[PDB]
Amino acid sequence: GAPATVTEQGEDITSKKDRGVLKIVKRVGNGEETPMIGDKVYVHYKGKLSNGKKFDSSHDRNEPFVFSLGKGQVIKAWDIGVATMKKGEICHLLCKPEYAYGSAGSLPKIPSNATLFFEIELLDFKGE
Template sequence: MTTDEGTSNDGENPAAIVVEQGEDITIKKDRGVLKIVKRVGTSEETPMIGDKVYVHYKGKLSNGKKFDSSRDRNEPFVFSLGKGKR
């Protein structure tokens, strides 16, 4: 999945509401962190536990102000799937 700028969701997809409002991914469901998928991946392949995953993201406040972006740094966020840092 990616979060490319300029990619739109025309509302024909059932996830259109999530794209517009964001999915609350907080434990308390207080809308402190919202996830918005801009474009769903099209590959049949999915990563397995331990695979290295590269993602781009943009962090924005509720007023729309951007506070972080992996694309601005031209560097994806990289992590091993299913392996937390301790």
Template sequence: MGSSCRFAMCVFVYIFYLLVLGVCGEIEVFEVDGVKVERLKIPETCDFSVQDGDQLKIHYRGTLEDGTEFDSSYSRNSPFAFTIGKGQVIKGWDIGIKGMCIGEKRKLTIPPDKGYGDQGFPPKIPGGATLIFETELIDID
């Protein structure tokens, strides 16, 4: 293969990579009351979105900033059920889950003041810990 063909092939591969990255790599990121929200998977349709008072079923994986997992509904093979906006979960969840659609996946980065604060939740969550949750909304009742 001549050098001009190799160059053309490299350009083609690079353009293809950029197109794939543009289509597949787009993640919506925003912040609400100090909670960073990354929409990892957005459903094509959304008939209902989460509002205060909704009963939810959510799968999640919780980690510390260093990647240490402290809890996961996946390991129990059962989504977590709760009512949003009623203080049944940490503030960061009440903030970061509002507006989700069934099938949506979000990554929440929750600062200590919206998580377990300075006291933490021993033994797995130290005081002052920033929490990372990968969440997936399974159902809204």
């Protein structure tokens, strides 16, 4: 399924080249520009564990997830991954634990040492 495919066929987008964050572009976005550091980004997402269980989805809330890019407001894999996206893009992101919740996890749903799968849609980005 999709998690296996991004694991086996995804692009390493880390600057360290450690395969900690893998990406596949699923829907091509608009033009060329990607957000810049500090922009207010609006996304929809769904996340799953490696046991197949969905842990969260913004679609279920009828509102986007909003954060300031490149400021450590989200897990490392998201700062890295969302920075590569075009407006309107949908991607799949595989996040090894060192770029996610590490040994701590996120209690109760995300266990220790968890590799995470996300589908992410970049809705919009704005400077303030």
